[PDB]
Ligand SMILES: Nc1ncnc2c1ncn2[C@@H]1O[C@H](COP(=O)(O)OP(=O)(O)NP(=O)(O)O)[C@@H](O)[C@H]1O
C-alpha cells in the first residue's frame with residue numbers, strides 16, 4: 001500500500017488507490033489535546049501515546065494544540081496527526097509506504113535544490129514510535145518527500161509550452177507557499193515561503209471573537225465558522241451569544257482584508273508568469289482578489305472546486 | 321575533440337564533427353541568474369560556481385544577467401555560458417579543444433592585423449576554473465580565436481574573383497560587425513564594429529513592453545517574441561495582458577525601424593563591394609532592407625536559411 | 641517647517657533647519673512588524689495603524705517587514721517609516737512640507753527626464769492616512785521629490801568645469817544608483833539603477849548566519865553586525881553561539897566579495913568621467929575597491945565621513 005499524505009499543519013490530506021484501482025481521498029483535521037479523552041456511550045475516542053506523552057483527537061477543546069508553525073513539520077504531534085488520519089481513513093491497519101510533503105523553503109535551498117538535511121529530518125520524524133490505546137496503529141515503512149505547492153500544477157503544466165510559466169499560489173493554515181514553474185515542469189524560476197502568512201491570521205482572530213461570544217473552542221471550530229461564513233443560519237446555530245455575531249463576522253472580515261493585502265503585496269514580487277493557479281484551503285478566500293490583481297486573462301486562471309486537495313491529488317497523479 | 325564555438329553575447333553556437341564524420345550543430349541561449357535554481361519534479365537544473373559566485377541557467381527569470389556588451393567577451397558569465405552549451409550539446413563530458421570568436425574591432429587593430437593582446441585575453445578567460453553542482457564540467461584544453469563576420473563568407477569567397485569584394489554584414493544581439501573582404505580571402509578592405517547597434521535595441525524595447533503587459537521575463541523570452549512576431553496566435557498565447565498586445569508589437573515595430581535606419585546609414589560608409597552577404601540572427605530582420613538599399617543584383621546577394629549559424633559553420637569548414 | 645527626507649528602504653535620513661538657523665540630522669532604521677508592540681516598564685513603544693493594518697517599530701524582531709525592493713517606494717510601510725522618523729527626530733509634531741526621494745530609474749525615464757507618473761505616485765503615497773496609538777502624528781502638507789544619487793554631488797559639482805563629469809555611485813540597502821553628471825550640474829550623461837544590487841545581499845547572508853548561530857533577529861540587527869564587522873569584541877557580545885562567529889564573519893565576507901565584484905562590473909559600463917564619488921551606507925564597504933578599480937587620481941576621488949547622509953545633505957544645500 002502506497003498512500004499520498006499531504007500532511008499540512010491544519011489538515012492531513014490523504015489520497016491512495018484501492019485494490020480495484022479506484023482513487024480515494026480523506027481529510028483529517030489536526031485538533032489534538034495533550035490528554036486522553038473520555039468515552040461516553042457510543043463515542044469512539046482515539047487516545048495515543050508518543051514518547052511518554054498522551055494525546056487524543058479532540059475537535060472542540062479550546063486546549064487543542066495550536067500547530068500553526070514550521071516546527072510542526074518535524075514535531076511529535078505531526079506523527080500523531082498522520083497516524084490518526086490513517087486510522088480514520090477507512091484503510092485497514094497495515095504497513096504502508098507514504099509520500100509526504102514539506103513547505104517550499106524547507107524542501108529547497110536558496111538555489112532550488114533539495115535540502116537533503118531537512119528532507120531526511122522529515123523522513124526520520126515518522127520513525128518515532130507511537131501507541132494507540134486499545135488498538136493497533138499502521139506501521140509506516142518507506143517515506144519519500146515532495147515539495148508543497150508545485151505538485152498541484154502537474155496536469156496544467158502538461159499542456160503548457162516550456163516558455164510559459166505558472167504561478168502556483170498555495171495558501172494554507174500556516175504558510176503562503178508560492179512557486180513559479182516553467183511549462184512541462186522543465187524548470188523552477190522562483191520559490192517563496194512565508195510561514196507567518198497563513199489563514200491562521202483569520203483563524204486566530206475568529207477564535208478570540210468566539211471566546212468573547214462565549215463559544216470557547218478549538219482552532220478547528222473557528223475554521224469551521226470561517227468555512228461557513230456565508231451561512232447566517234449556521235453562524236446563528238453555532239455562536240452562543242446571539243448578541244455578538246457581528247463581533248465574530250467583523251473580526252473575521254478585518255483579518256480577511258489583512259490576509260488579502262498581505263497576499264497581494266507578496267505577488268508584486270513575482271514577474272513574467274503567463275499562468276496563475278491558486279490552491280489550498282485558503283484559495284477560497286483569496287482567489288477573486290488574486291485573479292483581479294494579476295490581470296491574467298480568464299482562460300489562464302486556475303482554481304478547482306476542491307482546492308484543499310489540489311496538492312495531494314497532484315502528488316498522486318505524479319507518483320502513483 | 322575539436323569544437324567550434326561561436327560564443328555570441330546572446331547565444332552560443334556550437335559545431336563539431338562526430339567520430340563517424342557527421343557534422344552536428346547546437347545553439348545555447350545565454351540566460352543566467354546569479355543564484356542557484358531549484359529543481360522540482362523532473363526538472364534538471366544547471367547550477368554553476370565560478371570564482372566564488374553562483375549561477376544557474378534560467379530562461380524565464382527577469383533577473384537573468386543582461387550580457388549585451390563588449391566586456392562579456394572576457395567575462396566570467398561567458399565561461400559559464402560556454403560550459404553550459406557544452407553540457408547541453410549531447411557531447412560526453414571531456415577535454416576538448418575549441419575555436420571561439422571575437423568581434424571584429426576586438427580581434428583586429430585599426431590596421432586589420434590581429435590584436436594579440438585582446439586575442440590572448442580571450443584565451444585566458446577560458447582558463448578560469450568553474451564547477452557544476454553535482455556533476456563534471458568539460459575541460460577546455462587548447463583555445464584558438466577567429467574573427468566574427470568574416471569566416472561566414474568562406475564558401476562564397478571561394479568562387480569569387482580576387483577583384484570582387486564581399487560585404488559581410490553580421491548583425492548580432494550586441495554588435496553590428498561589418499567586413500569587406502576580397503575574393504579568395506586574398507585581402508580585407510575594411511572592418512567595422514558598432515557594439516551599440518545590436519538586436520538588443522529591439523530586445524530591450526520588447527522586454528519593457530512585455531513587463532507593462534504583465535509578462536515580466538528575461539531578454540531571452542523577449543527575443544522569443546521577436547522570433548515569433550509574425551505569429552498572432554503565438555503572441556496571444558505568450559502575452560498575458562490580451563488587451564496590450566499592440567503595445568508589444570508596436571514597440572517592437574518602432575525599434576525595428578530604428579534598427580533598420582541605423583544599419584542602413586552604416587552601409588553608406590562602405591563602397592566598391594561587388595557582393596553582399598547578411599549573416600547572424602539579426603539577418604532575418606534587416607535582409608530585405610539591405611538588399612533593396614544596396615541595389616545589388618539578385619544573384620550577388622547572400623542569405624541562408626540558418627543565418628544564426630553561418631559564422632560557426634564557416635569556422636568549421638575552414639578549421640576542421 | 642520644511643524637512644528633507646531621504647526615505648531609503650533601510651533608513652530614513654532627515655535633515656532640516658532649526659528656527660535659530662542650525663542644521664539638524666536624524667536617521668531612523670526601517671524595522672517594523674505587523675503587530676502592536678507591548679510596553680513594559682519605561683519602554684515607549686510606537687504603535688501605528690494605516691489602512692486598517694497595525695504596525696510597531698521593532699528593531700529586534702525576526703518578523704520585521706523586509707523592505708528591500710522598489711515597491712517600497714510607494715508602499716504603506718514607507719509612510720509609517722517616514723512618520724516614525726519624524727516622531728523620533730525631536731521636532732514637535734506639526735504640519736511640515738517635505739522633500740523626499742526616488743531611485744534614479746523611478747525618478748527618470750530612459751531619456752533622463754522626470755517620470756511625472758512615478759513622481760506623482762510618490763507624492764500621493766504620503767496622502768495615505770495614518771494613526772499613532774495614544775498620540776498625534778505629524779501632518780504631511782506639501783511634497784516634492786528629488787532623485788537619489790545626484791543631489792549628493794552638489795558641492796563638488798560647483799567647483800567642477802562643465803567639461804569634467806562626476807560619477808556618483810550611490811550604494812544603498814536595496815539599490816545601486818549610479819549617475820554621471822557634468823560640471824555645474826549642466827548635464828546628465830547617464831543614469832543607472834540596479835535594484836537587485838544592494839547591501840541587502842550582505843544583510844540577507846548575515847541574517848541567515850546569525851539565525852544558525854542562534855541569534856535570530858531583524859535585518860536591522862544583521863546590519864548592525866555588518867557595521868561592527870571590524871570589532872571582534874562587539875561580535876562576541878552580540879553573537880550568542882560563541883562557537884559559530886566565523887560562520888557569520890565568513891558568510892559576511894563572501895557576500896562582500898560578491899557585492900564588490902558585482903559593483904565593479906557595473907562600473908565598466910561608464911566612461912569619460914573625470915571625477916568619482918561614492919555615497920550611501922554601502923560606500924564604506926566598496927570605496928577602496930572603487931578607487932583602485934577606477935585608477936582615478938587621489939584628488940579626484942570623493943568620500944565623506946558620513947556617507948549615509950551625503951544625499952539628504954545635498955538635498956538640503958540645494959532646496960533649503
Ligand atoms: N471551503 C473553504 N472556504 C474557506 N476557507 C477554507 C475552506 N476550506 C478550508 N478553508 C481554510 O483553509 C485552511 C486549511 O487549508 P489547508 O490548505 O488544508 O492548510 P494546511 O495545508 O493543513 N496548512 P500548511 O501547513 O500551511 O500548508 C483552514 O484554516 C480553513 O480555515
Ligand SMILES: Nc1ncnc2c1ncn2[C@@H]1O[C@H](COP(=O)(O)OP(=O)(O)NP(=O)(O)O)[C@@H](O)[C@H]1O
Nearest residue numbers: 328329330331492493494495519543600601602604
Ligand atoms: N529566426 C529569427 N527571426 C528574427 N530574429 C531572430 C531569429 N533568430 C534570432 N533572432 C534574433 O537575433 C539575435 C541573436 O542573434 P545572434 O546572431 O545569435 O547574436 P550573438 O551572436 O549571440 N550576439 P553578438 O555578440 O552581438 O554577435 C536575438 O536577439 C534574436 O532576437
Ligand SMILES: Nc1ncnc2c1ncn2[C@@H]1O[C@H](COP(=O)(O)OP(=O)(O)NP(=O)(O)O)[C@@H](O)[C@H]1O
Nearest residue numbers: 648649650651812813814815839863920921922924
Ligand atoms: N558605517 C557603516 N559601515 C558599513 N556599512 C554600513 C555603515 N552604515 C550603514 N551601512 C550599511 O549600508 C546600508 C544602509 O545604507 P543606506 O544608504 O542608508 O540605504 P537606504 O538609502 O536606506 N536604501 P536604498 O533604498 O537602496 O537607497 C545598510 O544595509 C548597512 O548595512
Ligand SMILES: [Mg+2]
Nearest residue numbers: 008148172280
Ligand atoms: Mg498545505
Ligand SMILES: [Mg+2]
Nearest residue numbers: 328468492600
Ligand atoms: Mg554573433
Ligand SMILES: [Mg+2]
Nearest residue numbers: 648788812920
Ligand atoms: Mg539611499
